[PDB]
Amino acid sequence: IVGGYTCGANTVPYQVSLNSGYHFCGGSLINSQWVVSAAHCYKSGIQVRLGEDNINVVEGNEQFISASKSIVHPSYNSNTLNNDIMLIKLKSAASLNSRVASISLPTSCASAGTQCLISGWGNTKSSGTSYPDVLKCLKAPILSDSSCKSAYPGQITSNMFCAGYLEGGKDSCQGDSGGPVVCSGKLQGIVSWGSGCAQKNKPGVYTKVCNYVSWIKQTIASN
Ligand SMILES: CC(C)[C@@H]1[C@@H]2[C@H](C(=O)N1Cc1ccc3c(c1)OCO3)[C@H](c1ccc(C(=N)N)cc1)N1CCC[C@@H]21
Ligand SMILES: [Ca+2]
């Protein structure tokens, strides 16, 4: 997260860290046994870390649970980043509490100008590398489709939306991939891609979760 603020310990209780010996992606808890992330975060050997604030210190409230299976959208395209979504099933159910809780799936799509909360442990610099210990937060609005398509001509599908600031300075970044975009208490996006971080006229691009609710529901019900 570039240009954000320190969320405060466990203030974003649905946020997870995907760990393979180091943090590499974010995700969102959607019930006690399933996490939603980005397809491009797929790898083998994922440990899901719940209840984290400082990802480098055991502070209490953490739960570490191995992934039992990861389900990449069957139509994910690694060239166009279309359908950049994945479900992760936990080997055992998380213990839900005030510090570890799920986020609701949307019943409808959010409109342009909706203000959302974006969070992650990714890089905090637009130039160069600086990874935080603790979770960072950013309030950002959903941009109109025309602005989004003007910024990334030819590259925006109906499964994507832009969020952020055209003037630059505030964006998600490397390491935030797969994390939540939460608007009015519902999960509307997944951190997917961008052109650098926090550059002018190059907002972040997010997977449009409201287009996948039926798919998520049906996939979880059969696994
Ligand atoms: C593995 C990919 C997804 C990678 C991913 C994310 C991304 O932007 N990619 C580059 C990419 C690939 C294909 C594309 C593309 C950008 O635009 C059109 O087609 C991702 C990334 C995510 C968000 C931002 C941002 N909000 N500025 C910027 C970058 N980067 C950071 C590390 C992983 C890498
Ligand atoms: Ca910790």
User: Look-up: residue for tokens 């953490």?
Assistant: 62
Lining residues, ligand 1, CB within 6 Å: 40, 80-81, 155, 171-174, 177, 191, 193-194, 197, 204
Range of the domain at 8: 1-12+103-210
Asked whether residue 85 falls in the same domain as residue 170, the answer is no
User: Which class for 171: exposed (0-12), middle (13-18), buried (19 or more C-beta within 10 A)?
Assistant: buried
Task: Characterize 22-41 residue by residue with b for buried, 16 or more Cβ atoms within 10 angstroms of its Cβ, and e for exposed.
Answer: ebbbbbbbbeebbbbbbbbb
Asked whether residue 60 falls in the same domain as residue 114, the answer is no
What tokens does 98 get? 């005030």
Residue 192: which CATH number?
Answer: 2.40.10.10
Asked whether residue 24 falls in the same domain as residue 45, the answer is yes
Q: Pocket of ligand 1, candidates 41, 177, 207: which has the most ligand atoms within 8 Å of its Cβ, to mutate?
A: 177
Which ligand is closest in space to the CA of residue 61? 2
Contacts of 163 (CB under 8 A, 6+ apart): 116, 118, 140, 141, 142, 143, 181, 189, 203, 204, 206
Query: Which among 80, 86, 102 has a CA at the least distance from the CA of 33?
Result: 102
Number of domains comprising the chain: 2
CA atoms of 134 and 176, how far apart (whole Å) = 13
Resolution stated for this PDB structure, in Å: 1.8
